[PDB]
Amino acid sequence: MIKQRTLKNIIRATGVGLHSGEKVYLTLKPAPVDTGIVFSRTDLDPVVEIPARAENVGETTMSTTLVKGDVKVDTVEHLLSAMAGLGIDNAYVELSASEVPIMDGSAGPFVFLIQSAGLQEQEAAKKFIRIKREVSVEEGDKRAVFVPFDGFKVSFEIDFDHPVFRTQQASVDFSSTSFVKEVSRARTFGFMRDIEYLRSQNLALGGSVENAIVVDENRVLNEDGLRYEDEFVKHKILDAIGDLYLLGNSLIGEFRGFKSGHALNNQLLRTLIADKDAWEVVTFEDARTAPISYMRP
Ligand SMILES: O=C(NC[C@H]1C[C@@H](NC(=O)[C@@H]2C[C@H](F)CN2)CN1C(=O)C1CC1)c1ccc(C#Cc2ccc(CN3CCOCC3)cc2)c(F)c1
Ligand SMILES: [Zn+2]
C-alpha cells in the first residue's frame, strides 16, 4: 500500500527573498496524516497559516503567492516543487518573513536538506488526483493542458526569439526518471532588460548570479554558465510541478505547457477542480500495480 509521507526530522535553512531581498529563516516540520503542506508566517502575532492550495493563490504577476487577508507568502513554487518531487504529503513550512528564500534559484538545496533529514512513511493511504478527461486553458498563444496518462509526466515548450535559445522543448516521465536528477537543479532565469525594469520598480531586490541565470542580449553572464543545455525549459517544468502541487495531492496524469507560467497554471488548476467529470481521488492498496513509485524514504 502506497503510504502518506512527512519529514523524519525538522529542517532549518536561511536565505533571501528573490523579490523582497529580505533575510528569511525557514523551518520544515513533520505534520500529521491529511494535513497537506501548510505555510506559516511565524514573524506575526498571532501566527498566520495558509494551506498551499489553489483556493489560496493570490493575484500577483511575479511568482506563485499564497494569501489570507492581506498576509502573503511569495514564491512558493520551488519549495512546493521539491515537496512534490519527493512525495511529501504532510509538512508545516514556517517562514520569518513574506517570501520563501530563493537559495541557488533551483529546488536542489531544498531536496538536499529534505533528503538529509529523511522522510517518514505514515499509516494512511497516499491520495492521488487521477486525470480522467483532457482539460485545457488558452490565453493568446499560451496553452496549458491536463491529459489522462497512467503515470505522471510533464512536457513543456518555451519559444523566446533570443540568441541564447538550446532546446526549448523537454518531456519527463517521472514514473521512470528522478525529479532529483533531471529537474531539481534547474535555476530560474532573468533577462537583463526585465531585471533593470523590476529593479526600477523595487522588485528583484534579492536577485544575483548566485540565485539566477542572468541572460543579457547574447549570453549567460553567470561565470560557470548552465547546469544543463536545456536548463531554461527544465526550470519551467520545475515551476509547473510546484504549481501542480497546489491541488494538494500527487497527480496521475500528464501536464503539457506551451509558453505557460503561474497565472495560466493557476487557471488550469481552478478549471480542473471545477470539472469533477475530469478527475477523481484514488489510493493504491498495492504499490506493485500502481503507475508511479517513490524513492526509498
Ligand atoms: O522573474 C524572473 N524570471 C522569470 C523567468 C523565469 C521563469 N519563471 C520562474 O522561474 C518563476 C518566477 C520566479 F523567478 C520563480 N519561479 C519564467 N521567466 C520568464 O518568463 C521571464 C521572461 C520573463 C527573474 C529572475 C531573476 C531575477 C534576478 C535578478 C538579478 C537582479 C540583479 C542582479 C545584479 N546584477 C549584477 C550585474 O549587473 C546587473 C545587475 C542579478 C540578478 C529577476 F529580477 C527576475
Ligand atoms: Zn521558478
Domain boundaries of the chain, sorted by first residue: 1-127, 128-297
β 37-41/91-95 pair status = parallel
Sign of the alpha-carbon dihedral angle for 282, 276, 58, 179 = positive
C-beta of residue 27 within 8 angstroms of C-beta of residue 11: yes
Position 233: which residue type?
Answer: V
C-alpha span between 40 and 24 (Å, rounded):
13
Ligand nearest the Cα atom of residue 64:
1
In this structure, the dihedral spanned by the alpha carbons of residues 174, 155, 227 and 105, taken in order and rounded to 10 degrees, is -90
Q: In this structure, how many other beta carbons lie within 10 angstroms of the beta carbon of residue 201?
A: 8
CA of 60 from ligand 2 middle (Å) equals 14
Probe residue for ligand 1, chosen from 19, 60, 194, 264 as the CB with the greatest number of ligand atoms within 8 Å: 194
Residue 272 half-sphere exposure toward CB, CA atoms < 13 A: 31
CB distance 194 to ligand 1 below 6 Å: yes
d(CA 297, CA 71): 34
Question: Is residue 62 within 8 Å of residue 87, measured between CB atoms?
Answer: no
Measured distance CA(277)–CA(148) in Å, rounded: 12
At position 67, the amino acid (one-letter code) is V
Q: How far is the CA of 5 from the centre of ligand 2 (A)?
A: 24
CA distance 254 to 281: 16
d(CA 200, CA 289): 54
Backbone angles phi, psi at 181, to 5 degrees: -70, -40
Q: Which amino acid is at 283?
A: T
Residue pair 47/58 in contact (Cβ under 8 Å)? The answer is no
Method: X-ray
Nearest Cα neighbor of 172 from 148, 160, 156 is 156
Residues 290, 126 contacting (CB under 8 angstroms): no
Nearest-5° Cα angle at 235, 232 to 238:
160
The Cα 260–Cα 139 span in angstroms is 9
Structure resolution, Å: 2.2
Q: Is 190 in the pocket of ligand 1 (CB under 6 A)?
A: yes
Write out the three cell numbers for 15: 536565505
Q: Which amino acid does the sequence have at 21?
A: G
> C-alpha cell of 62?
511575479
CA–CA separation, 14 and 25 (whole Å): 5
Is the beta carbon of 63 within 6 A of some atom in ligand 1? yes
Q: Which of 22, 211, 262, 294 is catalytic?
A: 262
Cβ 125 under 6 angstroms from ligand 1: no
- Which residue reads 506493485 in cell numbers? 288
Determine the residue type at 101: P
What's the farthest any 2 CA atoms get from each other in the chain?
55
C-alpha cell at 56: 489560496
Pull the grid cell for residue 221.
Answer: 553572464
Q: Is 64 in the pocket of ligand 1 (CB under 6 A)?
A: no
Ligand whose nearest atom lies closest to the CA of 195: 1
Whether the Cβ atoms of residue 85 and residue 238 lie closer than 8 Å to each other: no
> Rounded distance, CA 9 to CA 14, Å?
17
What is the three-state SS of the chain? CCEEEEECCCEEEEEECCCCCCEEEEEEEECCCCCCEEEEECCCCCCEEEECCHHHECCCCCCCCEEECCEEEECCHHHHHHHHHCCCCCEEEEECCCECCCCCCCCHHHHHHHHHHCEEEEEEECCEEEECCCEEEEECCEEEEEECCCCEEEEEECCCCCCCCCCCEEEEECCCCCHHHHCCCCCCEEEHHHHHHHHHCCCCCCCCCCCCEEECCCCECCCCCCCCCCHHHHHHHHHHHHHHHHHCCEEEEEEEEECCCHHHHHHHHHHHHHCCCCEEEECCCCCCCCCCCCCCC
Contact 201, 178 (CB under 8 A): no
Any known ligand binding at 162? no
For residue 16 the three cell numbers come to: 533571501
Residue 239 counted as an annotated binding residue: yes
Residue with CA at minimum distance from ligand 1 atom 20: 261
Distance CA 115, CA 297 (A): 8
Catalytic: 19? Answer: no
Q: Which strands make up the sheet holding 37-41, listed edge to edge?
A: 11-16, 23-30, 91-95, 37-41, 48-51
Question: What phi and psi values does residue 85 have, to the nearest 5 degrees?
Answer: -55, -40
What is the Cα–Cα distance from 269 to 196, expressed in whole angstroms?
A: 32
Query: Which of 20, 162, 164, 195 to mutate to test ligand 1, by most ligand atoms within 8 A of the CB atom?
Result: 195
